[PDB]
Amino acid sequence: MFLPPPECPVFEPSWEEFADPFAFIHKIRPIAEQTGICKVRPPPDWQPPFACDVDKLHFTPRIQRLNELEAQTRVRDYTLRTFGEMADAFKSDYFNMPVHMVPTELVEKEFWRLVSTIEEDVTVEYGADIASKEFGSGFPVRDIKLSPEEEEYLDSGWNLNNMPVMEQSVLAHITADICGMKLPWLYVGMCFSSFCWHIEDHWSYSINYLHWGEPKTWYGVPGYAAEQLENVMKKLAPELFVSQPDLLHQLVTIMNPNTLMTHEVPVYRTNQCAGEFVITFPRAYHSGFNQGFNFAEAVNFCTVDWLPLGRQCVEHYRLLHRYCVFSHDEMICKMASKADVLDVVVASTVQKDMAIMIEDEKALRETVRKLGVIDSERMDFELLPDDERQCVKCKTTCFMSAISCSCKPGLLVCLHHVKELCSCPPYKYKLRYRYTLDDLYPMMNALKLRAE
Ligand SMILES: CC(C)C1C(=O)n2ncc(C#N)c2N=C1c1cnn(CCN(C)C)c1
Ligand SMILES: [Mn+2]
Ligand SMILES: [Mn+2]
Ligand SMILES: [Mn+2]
Ligand SMILES: [Zn+2]
């Protein structure tokens, strides 16, 4: 027996409200961040054109078994037509019904039954990948000859290709290769194909658009309940919490929302239909499944609101020895170096994060100096491959500074883990720093000036 969570908030902005996506999100944040997810119905006039030949679109399917609490990684060939045909026949055969006459309530109820049952070993398939020449964005991009209809949506703020380059997303300024993160993912779904409970890398927002097809069912949990949900999962599925060698290597799972609700974790649901958006807020857990054959597109993004949470996330990561996707501080400094061309509100928020960064860095350098580290040299960390600049203990990506030691060449620790590097005496250690405090304070003041 399954009891559907309460519905999450649904917004129907006017064209005036809908115009600027970042302003609209900021306005709904008070409501939506209490539920973790929300749904956005664009004005009826807003309808981006979906033109597509299902025979030339091809992708490699991924296979998925559907067992509650079973571990899954978060890491053959179909055309969109053959997949679609496979998907419809599956659902149609499973229920002995036309795919559209099966109620969403029923598919939901059936999903939670089959993932629970040991006897059932339903496997399904799906597509998940970054856009490519074999399978491109569902939104119009610049390239062949576009219709005027297509051209109209080229520059839309809700065209998800545009989010990795809007200034209001601080992830745009990142000049590092983080393709997995800042580029939109494309998802081809069939009935029961499922995304396990997770939050986004670095606690970022995400936004998801269902282009066409049968709906996508979501479950969302507000950011404030994140560790509570983690406690419940740690008690019921500990194998998901054994630490992992690489970032692609995260274990996740399917878990009945009722189980979370039973343990006082607030959960909300929704059915995302074609032409609707779902937005997930920072550190809001979500999961769900598809009702049938469909096509979605999704991307992460980071508003100014997020910057302090961004800093908190990386400290988390340090404590948990989890790898980082990028350096938060390296991003902060990149923005500071372009203060003159920053949006004024952005510059203000960045300045505030940078002040915390600098006083924290000050204290850490005083601490390592009292541990006997005397020698130092400037080091351009941004030039090192990421796997070449992780703290050997906590795996954090170094940028502001690190300690090295001649006794163990090429190894680094962050300044929280000076004691974890070599067993040589302190004078053989070196402080590697990107900037001096004297370098940093003017960078921060440029941001201050820019913000008046
Ligand atoms: C079933 C699949 C096409 C799919 C999907 O439809 N969605 N829709 C939203 C999300 C998210 N977050 C999302 N994520 C999906 C997805 C990716 N990677 N994986 C593999 C591991 N996953 C179960 C967490 C599933
Ligand atoms: Mn099962
Ligand atoms: Mn997600
Ligand atoms: Mn530790
Ligand atoms: Zn460390």
Curated annotation (Swiss-Prot):
One of its GO terms (biological process) is post-embryonic development. Residues 8-49 form the JmjN domain. 2-oxoglutarate binds at Y126, S206, N208, K216. GO terms for molecular function: DNA binding; histone binding; histone demethylase activity; histone H3K4 demethylase activity; histone H3K4me/H3K4me2/H3K4me3 demethylase activity; nucleic acid binding; sequence-specific double-stranded DNA binding; transcription corepressor activity. Ubiquitously expressed, with highest levels in testis. Down-regulated in melanoma and glioblastoma. Up-regulated in breast cancer (at protein level). The keyword Protein transport does not apply. Its main location: nucleus. It is found in: Nucleus. A zinc finger (C5HC2) spans 391-443. It comes from the Eukaryota. The keyword Cytoplasm does not apply. Residues 152-318 form the JmjC domain. Fe cation binds at H198, E200, H286. Keywords: Acetylation, Biological rhythms, Chromatin regulator, Dioxygenase, Disease variant, Intellectual disability, Iron, Isopeptide bond, Metal-binding, Nucleus, Oxidoreductase, Phosphoprotein, Repeat, Repressor, Transcription, Transcription regulation, Ubl conjugation, Zinc, Zinc-finger. GO terms for cellular component: chromatin; cytosol; nucleoplasm; nucleus. Both the JmjC domain and the JmjN domain are required for enzymatic activity. However ARID and PHD-type 1 domain are not required for activity per se but contributed to recognition of the H3(1-21)K4me2 substrate peptide. The 2 first PHD-type zinc finger domains are required for transcription repression activity. Interacts with FOXG1B, PAX9, MYC, MYCN and RB1. Interacts with HDAC1, HDAC4, HDAC5 and HDAC7. Interacts (via PHD-type 1 zinc finger) with histone H3 unmodified at 'Lys-4'; the interaction is inhibited when histone H3 is methylated at 'Arg-2' or 'Lys-4'. Histone demethylase that demethylates 'Lys-4' of histone H3, thereby playing a central role in histone code. Does not demethylate histone H3 'Lys-9' or H3 'Lys-27'. Demethylates trimethylated, dimethylated and monomethylated H3 'Lys-4'. Acts as a transcriptional corepressor for FOXG1B and PAX9. Favors the proliferation of breast cancer cells by repressing tumor suppressor genes such as BRCA1 and HOXA5. In contrast, may act as a tumor suppressor for melanoma. Represses the CLOCK-BMAL1 heterodimer-mediated transcriptional activation of the core clock component PER2. It is linked to Intellectual developmental disorder, autosomal recessive 65: A disorder characterized by significantly below average general intellectual functioning associated with impairments in adaptive behavior and manifested during the developmental period. MRT65 patients have moderate to severe intellectual disability, developmental delay, and facial dysmorphism. Camptodactyly is present in some patients. Belongs to the JARID1 histone demethylase family. This is Lysine-specific demethylase 5B. It comes from Homo sapiens (Human). The chain holds residues 26 to 753 of 1544 of the full protein.
